[PDB]
RNA sequence: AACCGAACGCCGGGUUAAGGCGCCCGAUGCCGACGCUCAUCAGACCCCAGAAAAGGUGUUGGUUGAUAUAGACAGCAGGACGGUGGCCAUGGAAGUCGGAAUCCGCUAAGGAGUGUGUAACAACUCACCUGCCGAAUCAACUAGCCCUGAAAAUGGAUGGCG
RNA sequence: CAAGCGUUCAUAGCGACGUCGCUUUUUGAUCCUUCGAUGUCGGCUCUUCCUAUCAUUGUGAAGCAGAAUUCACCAAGCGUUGGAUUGUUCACCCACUAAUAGGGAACGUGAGCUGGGUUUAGACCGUCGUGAGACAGGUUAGUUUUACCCUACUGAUGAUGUG
RNA sequence: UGGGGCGAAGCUACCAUCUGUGGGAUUAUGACUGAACGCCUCUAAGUCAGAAUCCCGCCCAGGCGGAACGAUACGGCAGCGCCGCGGAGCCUCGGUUGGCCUCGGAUAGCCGGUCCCCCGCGGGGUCCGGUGCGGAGUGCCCUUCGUCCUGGGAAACGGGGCGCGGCCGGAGAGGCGGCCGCCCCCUCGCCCGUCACGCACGCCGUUCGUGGGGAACCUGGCGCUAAACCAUUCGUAGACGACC
């Protein structure tokens, strides 16, 4: 069954100014500017609210499986807005029995340098993506802070080091060591 | 129609095009398919890679240099698909293939000619917009081209050039239109007779 | 039915139109990737094989049983007098491959270089390169070489330098030089050209191209061995003492079903005289010819500082079976493909 | 060979069967209807030339039964008790290795218990019942279409091309 | 599907009573092809393919702490040996390793071999036969052709085309 | 090869020695965002990491596949390349105006103009104004197609002489444009008068791309001025052939 219409309005705050080039949404607030293309999903993105109050995504002659996606675009747009207003912060706390996982950021964000996970001589290196500023925290012991505007980029990068730090040929029930994400949040909370 | 054909491969469907080419090759018309990297295929990227790699394993065991020639350039790939739609064992079929001619990128003479597009092989038309695909360019690469990078950098060089011409041609039309208005009372009873039997309205 | 008792194949296929080579100066097939940042250099050269010898070096591989011991390494010595650059040549990239624009060689030329053109020469009138040269001095000496280099600057990408060997200097009976394009892997065309411009006609020795202790790859043609039976060629088993029709064979070529003998079954054929690219050989010593300032310097050859005799690498009675190495050699670790006197890229 | 049509002096025109109609290859170079599916092994025609039980909120239709503005469903908060080491079992089973059973109070609502787990508890959780939200929600079947089951030897066959 | 085992617990690992399939490396049926006879068993050598993965790479499992181990996925990339006995295929043992996985290609391969075993004619014992003689009942001796012809392949000259 | 020691040269042996080299796509798998499914979800649209895999790279062969540039037959008789422009004639055919150009999007594009802003006459930006079953529309545009007379109007410096020199720009396998002096010559598109052209007496391959492609021969100017194979030799190679 094709559903004649499905739609959704995103409520855009007074801080930000989205401006869509056809289908491609660009978002600029305090923090910076983000962009993303929905040159796949195939919907009608209107900016109906004057002053500038609403993104409305339509979908229109759509069967079930594209009706899904109405809401997913609607999300990556909120998720941009939160990114360019507040900005995200994933915290990730290192975990162990014994060998201290020994982290050291090494340009600005960029290189996250890990000696000694489980006594291993090989020093794991991990790049961040562009726009992702890693930094070793304070007010807490074994704990990184990945700051960035883009969720997509910030959470590969969590996951890259969370996955770079995996044990092999053991019980990972027992060997519960490595670095992993403890708290997805924001820089500014409001 | 008459004369030499030039088809711009981009945005077409590999075999859907080739059937149309091959019909007109057999009717004596000279076709020149260009830009075959751009040519694209239904089914998702990998599907057709996996399907190509299946081809590559097909190979005359007792000697392979006899066995099938899995050419790698898109020109060549398409040729193959056209050729399979000709009776190429026979003289008219080989005489046909000779009327075909196929390039990767868009060369001398053929940069410098306006050039056509088969809507009935055209992807936007033939396919549904919610379906997946390969470019024979990227397919050709992952199967053993050496020349995706080169035919990129050359086409970028050609595009920049062609843009100049398009813009100068754009500037002549602006002169045509301004010069119609700058002389519209000694062609104001010819333009009349144009618009009366349809021409120019 | 399966083979009862498994075993590896005999002798690789990735190698196997085992034919007498079509060429003989080892053709270089791939020129290293020119990173446009580091200076201009030539990437190849063209010595020739002399003979071999016992080198004694102190070792420095901490960890090994032979840290800090003497060892003897067998070495070749490749007679490598300086190569003259005659001409340059420009390659443009294309979809269809890598076509070549514009070969330009010098005013002058040589005479050994002439050799590597007209087969029988004493018959010939030696006319090669006689109206080319005429261009290196007139009004069309400014057209087709100046507008040309400007052209090879503009559209071109990769530039090689045709260089002929100095055959005359050698003890070989040969007089016919060994031309080859040697790629210039410099920084940027123009810089990689206003340079070749300058090295036309000009000597080029081994110490420009190469450094002592660089790993290099030797490219040459295998030493010839004629027709060989399968057991010498493909190195197979022998059949037992009993066998009625020949025991230096392969019993079973194929199954009486794939009804062709295959591709990849062992066979009689030309062995040796094959082209081969051997890689990653070390240079132990870059030599120096016995030159004059008063009365020879035979010394400056085999006289290492830890012995200080006055030897030439030439042993007593020459490198058996060509002669005395009278100019710049390179001493290479181990053995290299090909017989004595062989052109070695 | 043997299926289907059709029974063949030799020809022109017309017309058909069984078949077909991107192109090989004659015919759709219908501005053809209405549907269904996307196969990381698609499917693609009586023989005939390949698969099954069985799987499969892959998607699409039914069927039946449910639930609900006295405001559900889903989500986030609070309780989940007492009579009560209830009885059997004791080896511990006070709700809980197991079973007969086996119901009241406070009731709001809490099963003499779904489980975690605990030697047994606790502590936690779940039924039950609340708090917050606003309208559709849920379950079992049954079918359509695809996915899995599904593994073979010179290279590879909806006929090929696609 | 699922009754069980597995201390407990179906399903980590297993799994009865039932039941649905493949596969053609087992033997049968069958008798379609060949009796102007396609060389009839094993061994050697040599290729190549399959996976029905014994090792190794990357992985998901475990009743996985480690160590060690089995279940499974992609996966066929490179591996799978030396011997005593035995005509043997088949076996069993010693030994090494990393493994000592399983298979196909006219039960791969006699103008490749050998001919040990089958299976001629000479012989010997066992039994049966009155006998000639019989016996998957033993045992020793027993001629193993021909390539030059087209093809495949391996090399080698060459070929039309580019004046 | 009477026997046997020792034995250069040459072959030759884990029986001596040397050398074996790198990227990409992703499988399983593991993940990010995140839908269906006001939550959760590796996924429904999007991403990421990922191998003895696969493909490629080094490596080996090198096409009824191309490249560049050399020299081009002195002659004792030769024979040609251009270039131009000349005269006959075998043959092999197909054709019977051209179109001289953006990029791509497709739940979007096209064009104008910028007043304004930034960059290198252009490019990018912002604003407005038009077109968008598209009219600076491949349903498209252009150019003409029986000949010349002469004697009006509309149109007036257009065209030409293989007219002639110089400077451009164009290289992916260019083969083409483009743009500047000077000579001589001509006055053509559209209306109209006005006359004319073998009017072949209803008939077929009519019209051009045509100075086609190719193969044979009659004029001038300028250049040209061999190599290949055999024989011989050598071996770097060997059956002979092949090759240095
Ligand atoms: Mg372990
Ligand atoms: Mg095996
Ligand atoms: Mg014998
Ligand atoms: Mg039990
Ligand atoms: Mg026979
Ligand atoms: Mg498997
Ligand atoms: Mg043995
Ligand atoms: Mg057999
Ligand atoms: Mg035989
Ligand atoms: Mg045989
Ligand atoms: Mg016998
Ligand atoms: Mg007998
Ligand atoms: Mg007796
Ligand atoms: Mg008796
Ligand atoms: Mg990768
Ligand atoms: Mg995945
Ligand atoms: Mg990736």
Give chain A positions within 8 Å (CB) of B133.
none
A66 touches chain B (CB under 8 A): yes
Q: Is the sign of the CA dihedral C84, C86, C92, C97 positive or negative?
A: negative
Which chain B residues 68-97 have CB under 7 A to strand D? 68, 80-81, 84-87
Q: Which nucleotide is nearest to B58 (CA to C1')?
A: D155
Cβ atoms of B169 and B69 within 8 Å: the answer is no
Largest CA distance in chain B: 82
Q: Phi and psi (nearest 5°) for C297?
A: -140, 65
Helix axes B14-25, B74-83, angle to 10 degrees: 60
Q: In what order do the strands lie in the sheet with A124-127?
A: A102-105, A111-115, A124-127
Give the separation between CA B134 and CA B52, rounded to whole angstroms. Answer: 12
Give the separation between CA B167 and CA B198, rounded to whole angstroms. Answer: 30
Question: Which of these, C97, C136, C132, lies nearest to C113 by C-alpha position?
Answer: C132
- CB atoms < 10 A from the CB of C10, how many? 15
Give chain B positions within 8 Å (CB) of C258.
61-62
Give the separation between CA A167 and CA A170, rounded to whole angstroms. Answer: 7
**Alpha helical stretches, state H, C97-195:** 112-115, 148-154
Beta bridge partners of A136: A144
Helices and strands (H and E) in chain B: how many: 8, 4
Strand ranges (E), chain B: 5-8, 31-34, 40-42, 133-135
- In angstroms, the first-to-last Cα distance of chain A is 43
Give the separation between CA B111 and CA B113, rounded to whole angstroms. Answer: 6
Question: Which of these, C180, C248, C224, C191, lies nearest to C37 by C-alpha position?
Answer: C191
Give the separation between CA B94 and CA B86, rounded to whole angstroms. Answer: 8
- Give the dihedral of Cα atoms C31, C37, C39, C45; nearest 10 deg: -10
Distance between the alpha carbon (CA) of C253 and the C1' atom of F200, Å: 87
- Across the B:C interface, residue pairs with CB atoms under 8 Å apart total 22
Beta bridge partners of B102: B33
Plot region of C167 (φ>0 → left; ψ -120 to 50 → alpha; else → beta): alpha
Give the separation between CA C48 and CA C342, rounded to whole angstroms. Answer: 5
- CB atoms < 10 A from the CB of A138, how many? 8
Give the separation between CA A10 and CA A154, rounded to whole angstroms. Answer: 23
Measuring CA to CA, how many Å separate A177 from each of A114, B198, C290? 13, 82, 68
Integer-rounded Cα radius of gyration of chain A: 20
Burial class of residue C139 in the structure, from the number of CB atoms within 10 Å of its CB (0-12 exposed, 13-18 middle, 19+ buried): exposed
Query: Within a 13 Å sphere around the CA of A17, how many CA atoms are in the beta-carbon half?
Result: 4
Q: Is the sign of the CA dihedral B52, B53, B54, B55 positive or negative?
A: positive
Tell if the CB–CB gap between C263 and B64 is shorter than 8 Å. yes
Give the separation between CA C116 and CA C110, rounded to whole angstroms. Answer: 11
Q: How far away is chain B from the Cα of C253, in angstroms, using its nearest Cα?
A: 12
The technique by which this structure was obtained is cryo-EM
B/e letters for A35-59, b = 16+ CB within 10 Å, e = fewer, are ebebeebebebeeeeeeeeebebeb
């Amino acid at each position: 069954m094709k559903t004649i219409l499905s739609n959704q309005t995103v409520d855009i705050p007074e801080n930000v100014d989205i401006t869509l080039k056809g289908r491609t949404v660009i978002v600029k607030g305090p923090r910076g500017t983000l962009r993303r293309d929905f040159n796949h999903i195939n919907v009608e993105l209107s900016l109906l609210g004057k002053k500038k109050k609403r993104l409305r995504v339509d979908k229109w002659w759509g069967n079930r499986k594209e009706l899904a996606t109405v809401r997913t675009i609607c999300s990556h747009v909120q998720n941009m807005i939160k990114g360019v207003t507040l900005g995200f912060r994933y915290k990730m706390r290192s975990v162990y029995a014994h060998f201290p996982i020994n982290v050291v950021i090494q340009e600005n964000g960029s290189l996250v340098e890990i000696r000694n996970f489980l006594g291993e001589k090989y020093i794991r290196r991990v790049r961040m993506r562009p726009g992702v500023a890693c930094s070793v925290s304070q007010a807490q012991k074994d704990e990184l802070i990945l700051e960035g505007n883009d969720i997509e980029l910030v959470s590969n990068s969590a996951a890259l080091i969370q996955q770079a730090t995996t044990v092999k040929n053991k019980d990972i029930r027992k060997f519960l060591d490595g670095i992993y994400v403890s708290e997805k949040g924001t820089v500014q909370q409001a | 129609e008459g004369q030499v054909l030039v088809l711009d491969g981009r945005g077409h469907l590999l075999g859907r095009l080739a059937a149309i080419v091959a019909k007109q090759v057999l009717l004596g018309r000279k076709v020149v398919v260009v830009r075959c990297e751009g040519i694209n295929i239904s089914g998702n990227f990998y599907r057709n890679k996996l399907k190509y790699l299946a081809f590559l394993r097909k190979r005359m065991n007792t000697n392979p240099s006899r066995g099938p020639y899995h050419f790698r350039a898109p020109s060549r790939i398409f040729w193959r698909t056209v050729r399979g739609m000709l009776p190429h064992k026979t003289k008219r079929g080989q005489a046909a293939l000779d009327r075909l001619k196929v390039f990767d990128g868009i060369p001398p003479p053929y940069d410098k000619k306006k050039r056509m597009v088969v809507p009935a092989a055209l992807k936007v038309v033939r396919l549904k917009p919610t379906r997946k695909f390969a470019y024979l360019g990227r397919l050709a690469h992952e199967v053993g081209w050496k020349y995706q990078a080169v035919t990129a950098t050359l086409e970028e060089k050609r595009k920049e050039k062609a843009k100049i011409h398009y813009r100068k041609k754009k500037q002549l039309m602006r002169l045509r239109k301004q010069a119609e208005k700058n002389v519209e009372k000694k062609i104001d009873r010819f333009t009349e007779v144009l618009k009366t039997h349809g021409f120019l309205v | 039915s399966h083979r009862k008792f498994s075993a590896p194949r005999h002798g690789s296929l990735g190698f196997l139109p085992r034919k007498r080579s079509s060429r003989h100066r080892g053709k270089v097939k791939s020129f290293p990737k020119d990173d446009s940042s580091k200076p201009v250099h030539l990437t190849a050269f063209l010595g020739y094989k002399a003979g071999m010898t016992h080198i004694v070096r102190e070792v420095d591989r901490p960890g090994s049983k032979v840290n800090k011991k003497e060892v003897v390494e067998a070495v070749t010595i490749v007679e490598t007098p300086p190569m003259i650059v005659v001409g340059i040549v420009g390659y443009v990239e294309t979809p269809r491959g890598l076509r070549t624009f514009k070969t330009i060689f010098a005013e002058h030329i040589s005479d050994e270089c002439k050799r590597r053109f007209y087969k029988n020469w004493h018959k010939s009138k030696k006319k090669a390169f006689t109206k080319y040269c005429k261009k290196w001095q007139d009004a069309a000496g400014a057209a087709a070489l100046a507008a040309d280099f400007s052209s090879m600057k503009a559209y071109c990408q990769v530039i090689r330098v045709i260089a002929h060997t100095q055959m005359r200097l050698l003890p070989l009976r040969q007089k016919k030089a060994h031309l080859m394009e040697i790629q210039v892997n410099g920084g940027t065309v123009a810089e990689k050209l206003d340079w070749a411009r300058e090295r036309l006609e000009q000597q080029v020795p081994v110490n420009q191209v190469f450094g002592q202790d660089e790993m290099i790859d030797v490219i040459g043609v295998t030493k010839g061995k004629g027709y060989k039976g399968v057991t010498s060629r493909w190195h197979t088993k022998k059949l037992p003492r009993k066998t009625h029709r020949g025991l230096r064979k392969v019993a079973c070529i194929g199954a009486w079903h794939p009804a062709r003998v295959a591709f990849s079954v062992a066979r009689a054929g030309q062995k040796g005289y094959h082209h081969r690219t051997e890689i990653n050989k070390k240079i132990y010593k870059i030599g120096q010819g016995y030159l004059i300032k008063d009365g020879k310097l035979i010394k400056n050859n085999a006289s290492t500082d830890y012995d200080l005799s006055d030897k030439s690498i030439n042993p007593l009675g020459g490198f058996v079976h060509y002669g005395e190495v009278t100019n710049d050699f390179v001493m290479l670790k181990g053995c290299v493909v090909g017989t004595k006197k062989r052109v070695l890229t």
